[PDB]
Design a protein around this nucleic acid. Sequence first.
DNA 1: ATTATGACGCT
Length: 425
Amino acid sequence: GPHMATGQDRVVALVDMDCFFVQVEQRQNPHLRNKPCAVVQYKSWKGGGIIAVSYEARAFGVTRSMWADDAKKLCPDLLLAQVRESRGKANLTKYREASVEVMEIMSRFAVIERASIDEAYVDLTSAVQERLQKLQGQPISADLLPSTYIEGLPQGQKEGMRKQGLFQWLDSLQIDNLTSPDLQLTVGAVIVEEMRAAIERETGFQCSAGISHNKVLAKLACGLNKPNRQTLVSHGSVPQLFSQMPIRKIRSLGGKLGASVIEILGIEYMGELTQFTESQLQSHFGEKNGSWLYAMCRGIEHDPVKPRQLPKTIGCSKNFPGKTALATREQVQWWLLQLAQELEERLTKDRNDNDRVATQLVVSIRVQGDKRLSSLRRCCALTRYDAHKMSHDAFTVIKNCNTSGTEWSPPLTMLFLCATKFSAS
DNA sequence: ATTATGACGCT
Ligand SMILES: [Mn+2]
Ligand SMILES: [Mn+2]
Ligand SMILES: [Mn+2]
């Protein structure tokens, strides 16, 4: 009872830009705004592959990882913006720079963990305490939460429901108790409204957000009310929310482990996990995953918000699928040089902006007909930011997968160069 | 033949 800690010590938010690459292109080209549109990579094979879809286009069924020519069959008015091509490959620079604009704004409010190009986690605990002291017992007005949903409410027109749920929540609030977790989540959500208003003011970009007590719940909440909304998931709402949440919807259970939870335990929903003891879960899924599942199904997770705004590795990848696979020495050399040239550019920019050098070069390849996504991965030193040297070293490090007697066999379906092991410069 | 990245666990 009194000693069963409930993991309500922290206020954590997950901010995620709505259809991020599409918004970046829509800011740049007003003719795309408020339209069914999508962002693609390449154009020759089937119109190119869609990696980002506006909500207007999604309403027609257009999804990521879909071919543009197929999307056009669902949505013939679909507008398409194309990723930049440099040295014969996709160049995502525009989106990395847009991402940095957003991250730098978020960083003004609290310490952030960059979780992907378009999303970050925020530890708001200190911010909420400061703000709660600032109110001096003053109650929280619905006006301060104009885009916030309270998950699970109302109980007992879309905006009409949102406001009812918010009203129920605020009326039930204990504003004098500066230690109530629900009050803390609420103040956290006020701050997140402010953060999202500043992001939209200063970039033009809209985003959604989740506010809860840990990373997994913040992330799951962010997705409940997209786009351009934020959702507060309280500790108390977890039992009902999880009672019908498919296990695969939880961060990190979307794959094989989640499938084995479902198969081994004979269950479907997150809530069913509560009926197992911790030892039972550790037995089936190992001691780490077991402890983590035993606390997660009760709404409790301790993974911290890491103070890390910048990527820990800088990478350059190109697939050579089908008949385009690289089959000669000259080919592998030229593409290693193109990849190494983009890598050099990004690394030099990184060293000047962020005062750090990478010290290790990771070369990964896929060979044709190999089942694995990484047929091989080998590392070597990264000592100077010179593309010719980096490409030569990647060759040097991979050339003994060539089984020819100036040819390359098995032909290469993927090259990948990754700079890692950063040290302050 | 969606591609292009990137974090992190396991051993
Ligand atoms: Mn997003
Ligand atoms: Mn997405
Ligand atoms: Mn995202």
